[PDB]
């Protein structure tokens, strides 16, 4: 029976391979060749947020595109005012080993997670005036890598148990458990419509999950090593991935196949963070060579360096309005990049 | 140029900044001892000796407050979170001395001791763990006392040209772990055979950490 099932699985893999090959009319490079290049996108360190005493593994902008929250191994979850370099709050975490942080779409909650296997929800808009733990979400048996806020009541967390989950803040129980990965899930990216979310894992595979349903829709492959980071295209019909192979790749939702690859001969360092722009044309990526080489989302040509960090850039996120690109790195300093006129 | 509460907002940040510096200085006054135990070898006995995932154990000796993280509980990919511990003062490793003859139950192919050596090999010459020392611990040596006499060491290391004497065989065990260290110019391991009832486990860790403190002080003064 297993022999037949194993054969059947190989046949199914070949069946989807033929469908992807048949639908592959042409590469994105060939069709989008008449378009002009973006040009030399030079950036300047407008702000130099310097409050963290240790390595920075996560950051996330707010919905207002002004407040950002950074998580560091010091044990702090500082919430900064990027406009004036003011620290609105300095949340002391229970466990110093935090590798993910999130900002609620409403802005009243921030979540942290890491090697403690617990996603801790913090309440900002409180009467007492001091941030407090709203609820600690437990149930994951492995290290938690990335958590994104669906809304003020639902949060999607991806851990190292090769499974993603959906939680309810009021109750604290896993409403849905997304399983199917064969490797540790390193990052997830909530879609703008908040109806689907994709997450890359250590098995060099990215799967399309459905929060409403609870099972995987499409599975994407092509990478050779662990997918460290993932981001979703603004239109909601594509998503980019970053892996240790130094070849960031763009995948199409409808086409169900890889479109382009972003690799350079000089670059061999792994990718720790990937983020698009407002129009989905400026594919920011945080490499391990202390740089953040800007990649064109339609030409696969480098358009920037962003080399201003002493250590690896662990996190990087564009704002909702696209007016700033924070590039928080292991050097304990965040950097609010911006394109000068 | 600054409003009434805009000036107060900056004042609030200064209080926040002072708390971070005050708490950051306290964190720099602490020793972080990572504990990479093997499979049913360590991180269960020594953890009690110095008084779901990360289980930080705190014990104070000689007015020094050590933080000991036992990450052995986690079963995920080690390479994807080992960078979180980059910068620890020392890495307390543990290898059982009774695993020389016992084979791995799960693998049923290679003995448990080689798996620890393979695990030790990756940790010793890891890219991030080049400066941090390794306080190697050979625990449960009391069982190894009579195990070596009844069971020869040729099961694990047939190249061992020695008799059933514990001291002759134990020295080879020490010599079989130092070679795995590649960066011999920036990291020295303090191997120490220890029993179960001995109370000197705490003292040796403090002595090995003190050597790391001296080396760190040397880098600051411009010397080493």
């Amino acid at each position, epitope marked *: 029976e297993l022999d037949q099932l194993r054969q059947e699985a190989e046949q199914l893999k070949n069946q989807i391979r033929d469908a992807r090959k048949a639908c592959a009319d042409a590469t994105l490079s060939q069709i989008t060749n008449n378009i002009d290049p973006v040009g030399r996108i030079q950036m300047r360190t407008r702000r130099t947020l310097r409050g963290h005493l240790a390595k920075i593994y996560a950051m996330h902008w707010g919905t207002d595109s002004r407040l950002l929250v950074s998580a560091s191994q010091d044990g702090k979850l500082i919430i900064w005012d990027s406009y004036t370099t003011n620290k609105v709050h300095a949340i002391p975490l229970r466990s110093s080993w935090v590798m993910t942080c999130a900002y609620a779409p409403s802005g009243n909650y921030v979540a942290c997670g890491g090697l403690d296997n617990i996603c801790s929800i913090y309440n900002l808009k409180t009467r007492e005036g001091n941030v407090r733990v709203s609820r600690e979400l437990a149930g994951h048996t492995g290290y938690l890598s990335c958590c994104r806020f669906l809304d003020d009541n639902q949060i999607v967390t991806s851990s190292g148990d090769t499974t993603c989950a959906l939680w309810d803040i009021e109750t604290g129980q896993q409403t849905t458990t997304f399983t199917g990965h064969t490797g540790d899930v390193m990052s997830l990216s909530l879609a703008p419509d908040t109806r689907l979310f994709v997450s890359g894992a250590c098995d060099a595979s990215a799967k399309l999950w459905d929060v409403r349903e609870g099972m995987c829709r499409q599975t994407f492959t092509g990478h050779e090593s662990d997918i460290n980071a993932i981001c979703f295209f603004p239109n909601g019909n594509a998503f980019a991935t970053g892996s240790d192979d130094a070849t960031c790749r763009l995948f199409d939702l409808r086409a169900d196949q890889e479109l382009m690859t972003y690799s350079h001969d000089n670059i061999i360092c792994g990718i720790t963070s990937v983020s698009f722009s407002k129009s989905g044309r400026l594919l920011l990526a945080g490499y391990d060579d202390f740089n953040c080489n800007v990649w064109d989302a339609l030409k696969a040509d480098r358009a920037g360096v962003l080399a201003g960090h002493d250590n690896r850039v662990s996190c990087l996120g564009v704002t909702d309005d696209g007016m700033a690109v924070a590039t928080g790195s292991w050097d304990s300093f965040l950097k609010i990049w911006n394109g000068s006129s | 140029t600054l409003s009434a*509460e805009d000036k107060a907002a900056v004042e609030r940040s200064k209080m926040i900044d002072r708390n971070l510096r005050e708490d950051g200085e306290k964190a720099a006054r602490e020793v972080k001892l990572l504990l990479l135990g093997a499979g049913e070898s360590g991180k269960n006995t020594i953890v009690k000796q110095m008084k779901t995932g990360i289980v930080e154990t705190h014990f104070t000796f000689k007015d020094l407050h050590f933080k000991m993280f036992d990450v052995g509980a986690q079963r995920s990919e080690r390479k994807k979170w080992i960078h979180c511990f980059e910068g620890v003062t020392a890495i307390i490793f543990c290898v059982a001395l009774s695993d020389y003859d016992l084979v791995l139950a799960e693998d049923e192919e290679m003995n448990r001791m080689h798996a620890s050596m393979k695990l030790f090999d990756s940790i010793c010459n890891n890219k991030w763990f080049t400066d941090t020392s390794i306080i190697l611990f050979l625990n449960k040596k009391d069982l190894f006392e009579e195990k070596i006499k009844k069971s020869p060491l040729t099961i694990c290391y047939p190249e061992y040209a020695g008799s059933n004497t514990y001291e002759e065989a134990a020295a080879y065990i020490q010599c079989q772990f130092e070679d795995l260290n590649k960066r011999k110019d920036t990291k020295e391991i303090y191997t120490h055979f220890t029993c179960s009832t001995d109370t000197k486990n705490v003292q040796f860790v403090f002595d090995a950490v003190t050597d790391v403190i001296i080396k760190n002080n040397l880098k600051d003064c411009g010397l080493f």
Partner: single-chain antibody
Amino acid sequence: VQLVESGGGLVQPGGSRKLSCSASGFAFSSFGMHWVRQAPEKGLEWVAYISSGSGTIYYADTVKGRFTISRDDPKNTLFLQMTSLRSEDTAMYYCVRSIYYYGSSPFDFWGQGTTLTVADIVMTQATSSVPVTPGESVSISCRSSKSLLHSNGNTYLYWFLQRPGQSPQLLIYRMSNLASGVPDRFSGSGSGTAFTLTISRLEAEDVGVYYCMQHLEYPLTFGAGTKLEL
């Protein structure tokens, strides 16, 4: 969030008394404190202020030097030392808290109140009393000597409602943002000089005196006060 105040009572002219405000139910250390007086049949007036950590201390011009303010965060208490009390100093003193960060609501909660029976921006209200009826819409307006719109883009207005027998309660902070717990029927807008408070259908709790307070320059001059007759 309770602010019990003590130290009030009859005093002789020129005497000295200490006013103690007790803070419980919130992080007193991280909250700035304000002292606001309320003379009988008169509008509110800012008295003194102490910052978080006792960093910056300010006093009103009429009370500068003559009064001193201190806090004791281990005991979660506020102290206002009164020296050389005159006949003008009589008022209904209130203990007011305020936190200062981006998106905060300063002057959110007010204390119970204690009575002591012994270049500035001029905020003027058009009328001191407007009759109202349930189901109607009223627009309380105020005036400012100088523009309150800082370059940051904020119109520094704080609306307060003083229910009879009750301490003033914040309604709208920064002239656009509604405070926590305030019904949505309250609304306000305007420019740095044009001021209004577009109130929806009035209810039983809408009675009292409405105050407009400026915050661009720290003297913190309150408005004349408009009463809403039932």
